[PDB]
mmCIF file of C-alpha atoms and ligand atoms in Angstrom:
data_model
loop_
_atom_site.group_PDB
_atom_site.id
_atom_site.type_symbol
_atom_site.label_atom_id
_atom_site.label_comp_id
_atom_site.label_asym_id
_atom_site.label_seq_id
_atom_site.Cartn_x
_atom_site.Cartn_y
_atom_site.Cartn_z
ATOM 1 C CA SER A 1 1.832 -20.443 4.027
ATOM 2 C CA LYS A 2 5.234 -20.247 2.422
ATOM 3 C CA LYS A 3 3.965 -18.775 -0.820
ATOM 4 C CA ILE A 4 5.135 -15.212 -1.450
ATOM 5 C CA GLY A 5 2.458 -12.586 -2.018
ATOM 6 C CA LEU A 6 3.768 -9.936 -4.423
ATOM 7 C CA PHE A 7 1.667 -6.788 -4.313
ATOM 8 C CA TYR A 8 2.465 -4.232 -6.971
ATOM 9 C CA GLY A 9 1.076 -1.010 -8.426
ATOM 10 C CA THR A 10 1.816 0.364 -11.884
ATOM 11 C CA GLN A 11 0.824 3.397 -13.952
ATOM 12 C CA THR A 12 2.660 2.800 -17.275
ATOM 13 C CA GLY A 13 3.186 -0.983 -16.849
ATOM 14 C CA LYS A 14 6.889 -1.198 -16.108
ATOM 15 C CA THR A 15 6.506 -2.363 -12.511
ATOM 16 C CA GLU A 16 4.151 -5.123 -13.681
ATOM 17 C CA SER A 17 6.656 -6.367 -16.269
ATOM 18 C CA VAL A 18 9.351 -6.517 -13.550
ATOM 19 C CA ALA A 19 6.941 -8.286 -11.177
ATOM 20 C CA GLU A 20 6.515 -11.033 -13.809
ATOM 21 C CA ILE A 21 10.296 -11.362 -14.036
ATOM 22 C CA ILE A 22 10.617 -11.797 -10.269
ATOM 23 C CA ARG A 23 7.927 -14.489 -10.350
ATOM 24 C CA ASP A 24 9.819 -16.313 -13.062
ATOM 25 C CA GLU A 25 13.114 -15.979 -11.285
ATOM 26 C CA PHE A 26 11.828 -17.566 -8.115
ATOM 27 C CA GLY A 27 11.564 -20.786 -10.170
ATOM 28 C CA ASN A 28 9.563 -23.541 -8.536
ATOM 29 C CA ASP A 29 9.053 -21.472 -5.370
ATOM 30 C CA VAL A 30 5.550 -19.984 -5.743
ATOM 31 C CA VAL A 31 5.065 -16.213 -6.009
ATOM 32 C CA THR A 32 1.457 -14.971 -6.492
ATOM 33 C CA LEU A 33 1.003 -11.599 -8.237
ATOM 34 C CA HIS A 34 -1.539 -9.064 -6.976
ATOM 35 C CA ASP A 35 -2.183 -5.682 -8.691
ATOM 36 C CA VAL A 36 -3.180 -3.325 -5.869
ATOM 37 C CA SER A 37 -5.760 -1.688 -8.137
ATOM 38 C CA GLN A 38 -7.815 -4.858 -7.528
ATOM 39 C CA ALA A 39 -6.819 -5.585 -3.958
ATOM 40 C CA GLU A 40 -8.247 -4.831 -0.564
ATOM 41 C CA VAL A 41 -5.809 -3.992 2.227
ATOM 42 C CA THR A 42 -6.891 -7.152 4.022
ATOM 43 C CA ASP A 43 -5.491 -9.325 1.218
ATOM 44 C CA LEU A 44 -2.089 -8.574 2.730
ATOM 45 C CA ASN A 45 -3.115 -10.650 5.770
ATOM 46 C CA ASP A 46 -3.059 -13.818 3.669
ATOM 47 C CA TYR A 47 0.732 -14.148 3.531
ATOM 48 C CA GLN A 48 3.627 -14.200 5.928
ATOM 49 C CA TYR A 49 6.142 -13.403 3.187
ATOM 50 C CA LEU A 50 5.394 -10.304 1.130
ATOM 51 C CA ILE A 51 7.056 -8.479 -1.736
ATOM 52 C CA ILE A 52 5.915 -4.853 -2.223
ATOM 53 C CA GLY A 53 6.469 -3.238 -5.601
ATOM 54 C CA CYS A 54 5.895 0.423 -6.358
ATOM 55 C CA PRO A 55 7.188 3.025 -8.807
ATOM 56 C CA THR A 56 7.723 6.648 -7.750
ATOM 57 C CA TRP A 57 5.644 9.228 -9.585
ATOM 58 C CA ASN A 58 5.078 12.994 -9.713
ATOM 59 C CA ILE A 59 8.324 13.929 -7.924
ATOM 60 C CA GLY A 60 8.473 11.737 -4.861
ATOM 61 C CA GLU A 61 4.897 10.499 -4.648
ATOM 62 C CA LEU A 62 3.274 7.085 -4.463
ATOM 63 C CA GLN A 63 1.716 5.380 -7.467
ATOM 64 C CA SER A 64 -2.011 6.099 -7.226
ATOM 65 C CA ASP A 65 -3.345 2.691 -6.304
ATOM 66 C CA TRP A 66 -0.689 2.308 -3.639
ATOM 67 C CA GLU A 67 -1.601 5.731 -2.172
ATOM 68 C CA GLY A 68 -5.136 4.369 -1.695
ATOM 69 C CA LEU A 69 -3.922 1.359 0.274
ATOM 70 C CA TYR A 70 -1.296 3.385 2.139
ATOM 71 C CA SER A 71 -4.071 5.309 3.759
ATOM 72 C CA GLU A 72 -5.449 2.112 5.274
ATOM 73 C CA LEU A 73 -2.253 0.394 6.444
ATOM 74 C CA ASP A 74 -2.988 1.294 10.070
ATOM 75 C CA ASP A 75 -5.880 -1.217 9.705
ATOM 76 C CA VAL A 76 -3.458 -4.148 9.311
ATOM 77 C CA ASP A 77 -0.916 -5.738 11.716
ATOM 78 C CA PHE A 78 2.351 -6.747 9.998
ATOM 79 C CA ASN A 79 3.804 -8.378 13.082
ATOM 80 C CA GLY A 80 5.062 -11.795 12.184
ATOM 81 C CA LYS A 81 5.592 -10.877 8.532
ATOM 82 C CA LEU A 82 8.790 -10.587 6.538
ATOM 83 C CA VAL A 83 8.586 -7.924 3.809
ATOM 84 C CA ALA A 84 10.778 -7.156 0.835
ATOM 85 C CA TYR A 85 10.512 -4.143 -1.480
ATOM 86 C CA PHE A 86 11.244 -3.325 -5.097
ATOM 87 C CA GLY A 87 10.705 -0.259 -7.129
ATOM 88 C CA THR A 88 11.127 1.161 -10.588
ATOM 89 C CA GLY A 89 12.284 4.750 -11.031
ATOM 90 C CA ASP A 90 14.429 7.081 -13.161
ATOM 91 C CA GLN A 91 17.703 8.117 -11.564
ATOM 92 C CA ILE A 92 18.613 10.645 -14.254
ATOM 93 C CA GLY A 93 15.360 12.578 -14.443
ATOM 94 C CA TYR A 94 14.573 12.417 -10.700
ATOM 95 C CA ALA A 95 17.932 12.274 -9.018
ATOM 96 C CA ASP A 96 16.672 13.889 -5.837
ATOM 97 C CA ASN A 97 13.677 11.558 -5.377
ATOM 98 C CA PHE A 98 14.949 8.270 -6.771
ATOM 99 C CA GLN A 99 12.893 5.366 -5.390
ATOM 100 C CA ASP A 100 11.185 7.465 -2.765
ATOM 101 C CA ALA A 101 7.974 5.396 -2.961
ATOM 102 C CA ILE A 102 9.405 2.222 -1.535
ATOM 103 C CA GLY A 103 11.023 4.181 1.283
ATOM 104 C CA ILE A 104 7.640 5.721 2.218
ATOM 105 C CA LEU A 105 5.915 2.348 2.091
ATOM 106 C CA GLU A 106 8.591 0.554 4.148
ATOM 107 C CA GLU A 107 8.520 3.238 6.848
ATOM 108 C CA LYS A 108 4.767 2.650 7.325
ATOM 109 C CA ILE A 109 4.896 -1.116 7.133
ATOM 110 C CA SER A 110 7.786 -1.302 9.590
ATOM 111 C CA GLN A 111 5.909 1.078 11.934
ATOM 112 C CA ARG A 112 3.128 -1.558 11.897
ATOM 113 C CA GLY A 113 5.456 -4.408 12.758
ATOM 114 C CA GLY A 114 6.765 -5.745 9.460
ATOM 115 C CA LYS A 115 10.337 -6.877 9.322
ATOM 116 C CA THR A 116 12.318 -5.751 6.273
ATOM 117 C CA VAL A 117 14.464 -8.225 4.387
ATOM 118 C CA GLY A 118 16.290 -7.749 1.081
ATOM 119 C CA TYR A 119 18.411 -4.625 1.568
ATOM 120 C CA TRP A 120 20.343 -3.744 -1.544
ATOM 121 C CA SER A 121 23.601 -1.957 -2.277
ATOM 122 C CA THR A 122 23.679 1.517 -3.799
ATOM 123 C CA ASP A 123 26.701 0.685 -6.005
ATOM 124 C CA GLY A 124 26.022 1.236 -9.668
ATOM 125 C CA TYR A 125 23.429 4.011 -9.420
ATOM 126 C CA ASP A 126 23.949 7.752 -9.955
ATOM 127 C CA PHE A 127 21.532 9.755 -7.847
ATOM 128 C CA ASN A 128 21.529 12.494 -5.221
ATOM 129 C CA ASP A 129 18.859 11.594 -2.677
ATOM 130 C CA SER A 130 16.317 8.909 -1.863
ATOM 131 C CA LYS A 131 13.812 8.261 0.907
ATOM 132 C CA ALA A 132 14.652 4.576 0.364
ATOM 133 C CA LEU A 133 18.123 4.941 1.915
ATOM 134 C CA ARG A 134 18.777 3.092 5.151
ATOM 135 C CA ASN A 135 22.280 3.583 6.575
ATOM 136 C CA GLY A 136 23.870 3.521 3.150
ATOM 137 C CA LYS A 137 21.829 0.760 1.506
ATOM 138 C CA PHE A 138 18.494 0.843 -0.290
ATOM 139 C CA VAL A 139 15.530 -0.654 1.562
ATOM 140 C CA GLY A 140 15.082 -3.020 -1.371
ATOM 141 C CA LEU A 141 15.749 -3.664 -5.044
ATOM 142 C CA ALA A 142 16.050 -0.515 -7.133
ATOM 143 C CA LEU A 143 15.304 -1.067 -10.821
ATOM 144 C CA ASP A 144 15.596 1.576 -13.531
ATOM 145 C CA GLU A 145 13.966 0.518 -16.798
ATOM 146 C CA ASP A 146 14.305 4.043 -18.254
ATOM 147 C CA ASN A 147 18.134 4.159 -17.991
ATOM 148 C CA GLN A 148 19.424 0.759 -16.939
ATOM 149 C CA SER A 149 17.132 -1.866 -18.449
ATOM 150 C CA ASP A 150 20.119 -3.994 -19.416
ATOM 151 C CA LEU A 151 20.877 -4.564 -15.725
ATOM 152 C CA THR A 152 17.408 -5.603 -14.577
ATOM 153 C CA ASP A 153 17.566 -9.360 -15.117
ATOM 154 C CA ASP A 154 20.917 -9.737 -13.377
ATOM 155 C CA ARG A 155 19.834 -7.526 -10.452
ATOM 156 C CA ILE A 156 16.688 -9.626 -10.045
ATOM 157 C CA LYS A 157 18.599 -12.909 -10.175
ATOM 158 C CA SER A 158 20.926 -11.758 -7.422
ATOM 159 C CA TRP A 159 18.170 -10.356 -5.210
ATOM 160 C CA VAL A 160 15.993 -13.462 -5.534
ATOM 161 C CA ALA A 161 18.900 -15.630 -4.369
ATOM 162 C CA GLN A 162 19.244 -13.455 -1.258
ATOM 163 C CA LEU A 163 15.464 -13.557 -0.651
ATOM 164 C CA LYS A 164 15.240 -17.307 -0.770
ATOM 165 C CA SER A 165 17.648 -17.394 2.187
ATOM 166 C CA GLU A 166 15.954 -14.590 4.110
ATOM 167 C CA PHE A 167 12.514 -16.151 3.718
ATOM 168 C CA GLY A 168 13.860 -19.567 4.737
ATOM 169 C CA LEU A 169 12.644 -21.314 1.615
HETATM 170 C C1 FMN B 201 6.104 12.540 -14.723
HETATM 171 C C2 FMN B 201 6.981 11.483 -14.049
HETATM 172 C C3 FMN B 201 7.517 11.636 -12.832
HETATM 173 C C4 FMN B 201 8.408 10.680 -12.232
HETATM 174 N N1 FMN B 201 8.813 10.846 -10.953
HETATM 175 C C5 FMN B 201 9.710 10.018 -10.486
HETATM 176 C C6 FMN B 201 10.315 10.255 -9.187
HETATM 177 O O1 FMN B 201 9.962 11.167 -8.422
HETATM 178 N N2 FMN B 201 11.232 9.357 -8.809
HETATM 179 C C7 FMN B 201 11.700 8.283 -9.613
HETATM 180 O O2 FMN B 201 12.504 7.541 -9.117
HETATM 181 N N3 FMN B 201 11.146 8.079 -10.834
HETATM 182 C C8 FMN B 201 10.222 8.895 -11.273
HETATM 183 N N4 FMN B 201 9.619 8.650 -12.456
HETATM 184 C C9 FMN B 201 10.058 7.479 -13.218
HETATM 185 C C10 FMN B 201 9.047 6.357 -13.069
HETATM 186 O O3 FMN B 201 8.969 5.863 -11.732
HETATM 187 C C11 FMN B 201 9.459 5.169 -13.951
HETATM 188 O O4 FMN B 201 9.269 5.519 -15.358
HETATM 189 C C12 FMN B 201 8.758 3.887 -13.631
HETATM 190 O O5 FMN B 201 9.374 2.797 -14.361
HETATM 191 C C13 FMN B 201 7.283 3.892 -13.927
HETATM 192 O O6 FMN B 201 6.702 2.662 -13.463
HETATM 193 P P1 FMN B 201 5.286 2.169 -13.958
HETATM 194 O O7 FMN B 201 5.371 1.975 -15.453
HETATM 195 O O8 FMN B 201 5.128 0.770 -13.256
HETATM 196 O O9 FMN B 201 4.250 3.164 -13.519
HETATM 197 C C14 FMN B 201 8.772 9.576 -13.042
HETATM 198 C C15 FMN B 201 8.286 9.486 -14.331
HETATM 199 C C16 FMN B 201 7.475 10.437 -14.894
HETATM 200 C C17 FMN B 201 7.002 10.334 -16.315
#
């Protein structure tokens, strides 16, 4: 399959709204949305191209539904999969743990064989520390709907263009 499986979690709905934007931005290239509150870890097996969305909560912690699946990721093999990440977070209120959730998820998924695509520049954010940092870039798209909502659509448009190349669409 060349459809993209987008698996997101949300507590206050912001990550879901951004997920819908990414689906729209992919245009006629199909992206299928999956809320992880309704998923089983084995649903991840169904795609070769995955997009993982998660907000960071409670000072550096996973969104609740994602924590449930996280615990079972050693039950899946991500070899042969290309995986991109996005997150929502607040760089002003949580400057020391900005986007940690996607960094925790990517470290596990890459341990299990997934190959990360979609690295994103840190220019234009004001933060101190992040578990999503990888040699000076973020592991994936960092969105901030609390402080930088006006930038979200442009950031998504750019990242989707990069993803279509990295997924070979
Ligand atoms: C109590 C609380 C703690 C938060 N902790 C973090 C954090 O550690 N890191 C961060 O980047 N954002 C943090 N956020 C910001 C949320 O990730 C952000 O509002 C996000 O858009 C929520 O996504 P959701 O609506 O999909 O759940 C926190 C927000 C609140 C209210």
